[PDB]
Design a protein around this ligand. Structure first.
Ligand SMILES: O=C(NC1Cc2ccccc2C1)c1nccnc1NC(=O)N1CCCCC1
Ligand code: PRO
Length: 494
């Protein structure tokens, strides 16, 4: 009990989350606010999705690279909308030892300015295009909002991809190709559904022509959260960094650029999605151990149980299924059950005397706790199919919750009702940037219906979904009363 999760996910989501990430050994806290340690179980997930994304961006001819952590004032300030957005959260190095630096230098919050400072040397003619680069690194955004492990941190691990193209068409195609890879990263590895859409003008990346986005939704507190992003930068950074190329007709042109990122926030979204009141729940593709084997003794005798459990370990490891046999003498079976449930292991296999006598074992799924007796010779196949089935169940259950978290409305008088039911709204909107602040202020004012002390009551535009319902001929904007343009998702958010 004391060693389990002692806050229910529905009753105290914030304390449940803290208990889950600590007791599963994902996260350790640190003496600098907003910075957290990724312990091995958390870093293993990152390596899994790193492996997947590398393999896929390789097919698009993107190549990994590594650029400096630091940027000079001269470079950092070249693109005005970019730096106006980041400048209050940029951390500056000013000293080495007790000596002042001759010039202060900034830590990257993102690397457009760093990388594009040298793109002009690499891109001189149409022969040099497309240029396609990625980095796996961390960046620093020194905000003073309340941090949350994985999802809102001052330093975070991510990849940032950056490409440059001879025209708009090719760059935009890559934007949406990357956006579908983020859909796959979340779906095939984290069993998380996302919504693709376009950011409103007030929410797009600074310096972007447009920002496409993958949005996730945390049903338990009614909060949307950006899962990944892929920007068409157009020629906006090419203008400011003078990234020009001579085209086939001997005319100077600006490159058309993209950048796109996805972070360890994805792990936090997975935890909040599938985690339950027993702790972490891992999709098998991001769990080091797919199976834990637990022995049960009453009280060859003890050697007979040990030999049998080791046989099952050999069967799984010979088939490339990593597993652990928990043969620790000092802890009860029920201790071990909780121990590994807490840590999110997908499958427990139990072996006691009655299972040995029947030449079977008990196979227990972490997601729904269903138990079944499997003969020894069918354990390999049953385990294989059950790992597939757990992932499918986690994803389908999550997708039903996401679907159920959207209410389509036509007037603002329906909005507050749905927000306080922890929903997002899909609403007809004129898309005028001026209305975004107005909507944020008024929904925050009317929220006077929240028990979160560190997240805003404001609802903001989340994304204009790529999948649009019909817009009836005279539908008005739900806020301004002007002709509505498209349907947009709004909600409270992280
Ligand atoms: O934005 C993050 N942190 C900042 C916001 C915040 C709030 C409280 C305290 C400190 C900070 C700094 C963030 N933190 C951790 C992991 N991913 C994060 N970001 C993202 O997932 N996205 C989407 C993909 C492109 C980049 C942004
Ligand atoms: O920070 C962002 O959103 C973009 C995409 C990764 C590179 N910079």
């Amino acid at each position: 009990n004391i060693l389990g999760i002692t806050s229910k996910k529905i009753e105290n989501f914030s304390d449940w989350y803290t208990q889950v990430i600590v007791k599963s050994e994902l996260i350790e806290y640190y003496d600098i606010s907003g910075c957290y340690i990724l312990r091995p179980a958390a870093y293993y997930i990152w390596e899994c999705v790193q492996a997947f994304f590398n393999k896929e961006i390789k097919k698009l001819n993107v190549e990994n690279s590594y650029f400096p952590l630091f940027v000079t004032k001269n470079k950092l300030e070249k693109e005005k909308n970019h730096i106006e957005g980041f400048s209050p959260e940029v951390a500056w190095v000013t000293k080495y030892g007790d000596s002042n630096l001759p010039e202060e230098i900034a830590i990257r919050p993102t690397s457009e300015t760093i990388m594009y400072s040298v793109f002009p040397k690499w891109i001189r003619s149409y022969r040099d295009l497309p240029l396609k680069l990625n980095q796996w690194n961390t960046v620093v955004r020194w905000e003073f909002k309340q941090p949350t492990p994985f999802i809102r941190t001052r330093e975070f691990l991510w990849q940032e991809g950056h490409t440059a193209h001879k025209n708009e068409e090719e760059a935009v195609k890559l934007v949406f190709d990357i956006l579908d890879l983020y859909r796959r990263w979340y779906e095939e590895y984290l069993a998380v559904p996302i919504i693709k859409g376009i950011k409103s003008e007030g929410e797009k990346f600074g310096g972007a022509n447009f920002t496409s986005t993958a949005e996730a939704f945390i049903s338990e507190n009614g909060r949307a959260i950006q899962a990944a992003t892929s920007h068409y930068l157009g020629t906006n950074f090419a203008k400011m960094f003078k990234i020009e190329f001579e085209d086939e007709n001997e005319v100077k042109q600006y490159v058309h650029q993209t950048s796109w990122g996805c972070t360890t926030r994805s792990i936090g979204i997975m935890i909040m999605t599938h985690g339950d009141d027993k702790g972490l729940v891992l999709p098998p593709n991001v769990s080091k151990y797919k199976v834990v084997i637990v022995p049960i003794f009453y009280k060859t005798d003890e050697n007979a149980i040990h030999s049998y459990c080791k046989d099952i370990e050999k069967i799984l490891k010979n088939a490339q299924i990593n597993c652990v046999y928990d043969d620790r003498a000092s802890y009860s079976p029920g201790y071990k059950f909780n121990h590994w449930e807490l840590r999110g292991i997908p499958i427990r296999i139990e072996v006691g005397p009655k299972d040995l006598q029947n030449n079977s074992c008990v196979i227990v799924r972490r997601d729904n706790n269903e138990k079944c007796n499997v003969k020894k010779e069918s354990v390999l196949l049953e385990t294989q199919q059950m790992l597939v089935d757990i992932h499918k169940n986690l994803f389908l259950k999550a997708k039903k919750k996401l679907d159920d978290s959207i209410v389509q409305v036509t007037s603002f008088s329906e909005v507050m009702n749905a927000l306080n039911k922890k929903k997002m709204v899909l609403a007809p909107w004129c898309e005028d940037i001026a209305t975004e602040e107005e909507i944020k202020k008024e929904t925050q004012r009317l929220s006077l219906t929240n028990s979160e002390t560190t997240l805003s009551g404001a609802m903001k535009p989340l994304c204009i979904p790529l999948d649009q319902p019909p817009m009836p001929p005279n539908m008005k904007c739900f806020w301004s009363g002007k002709p509505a343009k498209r349907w947009c998702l709004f909600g409270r958010s992280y």
